[PDB]
Ligand binder design. Structure first.
Ligand SMILES: Nc1ncnc2c1ncn2[C@@H]1O[C@H](COP(=O)(O)OP(=O)(O)OP(=O)(O)O)[C@@H](O)[C@H]1O
Ligand SMILES: Nc1ncnc2c1ncn2[C@@H]1O[C@H](COP(=O)(O)OP(=O)(O)OP(=O)(O)O)[C@@H](O)[C@H]1O
Ligand SMILES: Cn1c(=O)c2c(ncn2C)n(C)c1=O
Ligand SMILES: [Ca+2]
Ligand SMILES: [Zn+2]
Ligand SMILES: [Zn+2]
Lengths: 417, 155, 145, 48
């Protein structure tokens, strides 16, 4: 009775505790800016700078542990509910673990075979009579010895083993585990709290968009970096077979002069230096003036500058800047669509306007998708003795899942007035 | 009561009918609101629907506004609670629907673990999700938020 | 109030050519576009100061022996093995170069950390000079659009 | 241009009928409205 008091404190303060494991992780990475070389921290304010890190680095692993306990009681019950719904609506409305037996793909379909053997299967889905509905619908073509066997201080251990298959494969829980498993490593070495400023990126909105645009146009980006590593490779085989005498990283010839007449070290020279230069390769190469291969060398360098620095390095930057132009514009478009059409009607800002505050009251009162959610919360608390004439043409159609009762095109002014 | 300029003197005396029978010329604070308030907020609700149902359905009625302008101490109390939708009602004709929204459910469509789940959904659907599954994705969203609004209750 | 200060020193009438900017129309537009997309611009410069910071902590803990702003070893050779002066070296020089950081650093050829160094420099050139310095220019040119 | 050309072609394929040339809107009007119109009613495989 005191456990659920604290465990319902951390789920309440989760959004308001993740802004505390950031104002701490700046205060680690500000004291840590004072290090000096054995690595020993100096002082700039006073002598009490070292204990305000040993205080602050155990306080951070505690707070980064309370932000996964508060996650385990706020958002992981919901991701169970959206998962127990989709299983229970699959073997009943469609039939999956009897008629279909899913394939080698969709491992969550393969993983969810482990849950329907349990006693307490629909733990969150408000619908505790699924296991009676299947035997009445699929007990005919298949024998009810099987369906009674397939379905069915001692806790639901076959179920708790299933639940952890859903929590660990969950996307946002792994980030809350990598955020904590660095704080365990933050005491093996103090420099591992420098990988907690990357909570800025998954914390804002115009920084989450940059971190998405690197991989949003990603499946073309590998095939264009994969052309850089082939054009620069074909510029190696020509330079290795023809121009070995220019490739000196050496001094004056008197020194034990270093060359690039070896394939794997001529190749990494063309990519560590040949790409990042400004002139391609014609910077870090001895000047061709007195040679017979001079005209065959100016052609070698100009088409290096033109193909790899003018083209192929502009369209690799091009897929990271013009993916940030789609993903910013996508959001813009969504906002504009929200402010120029009705969600349920789908009509327009124009036809409803026609009067002062025309579209505003049409979406504040007449449709207002909040109200369509309270209306469906209404029928759950109303008894079926009490459903009136239209609150049971709806509630029949929702139990049937037909949804011809939302206003498709017209609302009220499109037939009256 | 008289200093609030709400009740006139023909009403400040009616409210003080007996109201105590207790020896001190006082009242009981939360029992007088227990006596008379809550058995007229759900009785009085269906009156407010009925005057709402007539004004919107029957316009251009001079006779109706005479009651209606007198009811504005009710129709400006229940308009927080009056949920109004529109459905295509069983006769190929769109008829408005009126119902009752609680107060333990207008205050838990705030509480931002529910607000963040809306904005994560509105952006998901008006971007992608064709017209053969748009309203299915709405009804599949209302089922989850009702589980969220239950979840934010027991915290 | 600069013209009062214009007689304390004659050089304060050089801040009166900034009346060109609030005087024309296609120069008032440039001076607006710096701050029109402004509330995202701080959050992108604020990612530059964190990616270049995370490139300091790796270079401070692993690669101290390459960071010589010195001459031939005979001189009283200057280093960058101190956090606050390795950090300002990565931002005064590491950002404004053309090749990121692989310009003003002694060349890695004879080292065991060589492969761990080419990876350090390529992803500096790609993340901070190719991406994050193009989309900070991008919010000042495409706000002028 | 050449990336956008392809994009446009795909979009045109998913918003008009090939043989009718009508639109995603007028055929939609019902669940799976454009889908069955091009799976059964025209379906340029069938004309071959
Ligand atoms: N059916 C609809 N229901 C509600 N709003 C709608 C509907 N159709 C269009 N809208 C538009 O959506 C806007 C509501 O804004 P939004 O849904 O982004 O949240 P908000 O009201 O701005 O509050 P918050 O952003 O804090 O959630 C309204 O201005 C309205 O113009
Ligand atoms: N007359 C038409 N016949 C067939 N498809 C049409 C027609 N008009 C439009 N379409 C659109 O073309 C799409 C068919 O896709 P497409 O022709 O690219 O091949 P596919 O069915 O995706 O299979 P694959 O890409 O493997 O050939 C359908 O989704 C349909 O919406
Ligand atoms: C009992 N019950 C239901 O019956 C129900 C529901 N959501 C939809 N239905 C149909 N919820 C949340 C619920 O508790
Ligand atoms: Ca009845
Ligand atoms: Zn509408
Ligand atoms: Zn057609």
């Amino acid at each position: 009775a005191y456990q659920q008091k604290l465990l319902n404190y951390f789920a309440r303060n989760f959004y308001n505790m993740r802004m505390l494991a950031l104002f701490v992780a700046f205060a680690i990475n500000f004291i840590l800016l004072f290090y000096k070389v054995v690595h020993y921290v100096l002082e700039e304010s006073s002598g009490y700078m070292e204990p305000t890190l040993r205080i602050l680095a155990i306080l951070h692993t505690v707070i980064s542990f309370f932000c996964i306990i508060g996650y385990y009681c706020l958002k992981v019950p919901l991701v169970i509910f959206k998962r127990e719904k989709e299983v229970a609506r699959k073997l009943e409305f469609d039939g999956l673990y009897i008629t279909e037996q899913p394939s080698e793909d969709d491992i969550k379909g393969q993983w969810d075979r482990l849950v329907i053997n349990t006693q307490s299967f629909p733990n969150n889905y408000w619908d505790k009579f699924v296991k009676r509905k299947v035997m009445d619908k699929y007990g005919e073509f298949y024998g009810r010895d099987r369906i009674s066997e397939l379905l069915g201080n001692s806790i639901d251990v076959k179920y708790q083993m299933w639940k952890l298959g859903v929590v660990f494969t969950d996307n946002s829980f792994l980030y809350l585990a990598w955020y904590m498993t660095m704080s365990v490593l933050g005491h093996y070495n103090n420099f591992f709290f420098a990988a907690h400023l990357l909570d800025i990126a998954m914390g804002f909105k115009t920084l989450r968009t940059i971190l998405s645009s690197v991989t949003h146009n990603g499946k073309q980006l590998v095939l264009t970096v994969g052309l850089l590593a082939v054009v620069v490779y074909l510029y190696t085989v020509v330079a290795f077979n023809f121009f070995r005498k220019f490739y000196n990283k050496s001094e004056d010839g008197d020194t034990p002069d270093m060359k690039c007449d070896d394939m794997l070290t001529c190749y990494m020279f063309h990519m560590y230096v040949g790409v990042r230069a400004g002139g391609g390769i014609g910077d870090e190469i001895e000047d061709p003036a007195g040679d017979e291969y001079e005209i065959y060398r100016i052609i070698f360098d100009i088409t290096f500058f033109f193909f790899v620095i003018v083209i192929l390095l502009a369209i690799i930057q091009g897929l990271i800047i013009d993916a940030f132009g789609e993903l910013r514009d996508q959001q813009e478009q969504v906002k504009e669509d929200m402010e120029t059409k009705c969600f349920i009607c789908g009509i327009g800002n124009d036809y409803f306007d026609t009067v002062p505050h025309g579209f505003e009251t049409h979406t504040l009162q007449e449709h207002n998708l909040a109200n369509y959610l309270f209306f469906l919360m209404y029928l759950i608390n109303k008894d079926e003795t009490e459903h009136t004439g239209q609150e049971s043409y709806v509630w029949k159609m929702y139990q049937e899942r037909c949804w011809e009762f939302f206003p498709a095109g017209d609302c009220f002014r499109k037939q009256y007035e | 009561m008289e200093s609030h300029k709400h009740y006139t003197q023909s009403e400040t005396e009616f409210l003080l009918s007996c109201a105590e029978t207790d020896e001190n010329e006082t009242l009981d604070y939360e029992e007088f609101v227990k006596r008379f308030h809550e058995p007229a907020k759900d009785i009085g609700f269906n009156v407010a629907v009925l005057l709402t149902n007539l004004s919107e359905h029957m316009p251009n009625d001079t006779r109706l506004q005479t009651f209606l302008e007198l009811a504005e101490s009710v129709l400006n109390y229940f308009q927080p609670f009056l949920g109004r939708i529109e459905i295509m009602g069983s006769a190929k004709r769109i008829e408005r629907v009126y119902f009752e929204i609680s107060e333990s459910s207008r205050t838990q469509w705030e509480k931002p673990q529910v607000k963040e789940s809306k904005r994560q959904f509105i952006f998901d659907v008006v971007n992608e999700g064709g017209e053969k599954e748009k309203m299915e994705l709405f009804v599949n969203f209302c089922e989850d938020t009702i589980f969220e609004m239950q979840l934010a209750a027991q915290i």
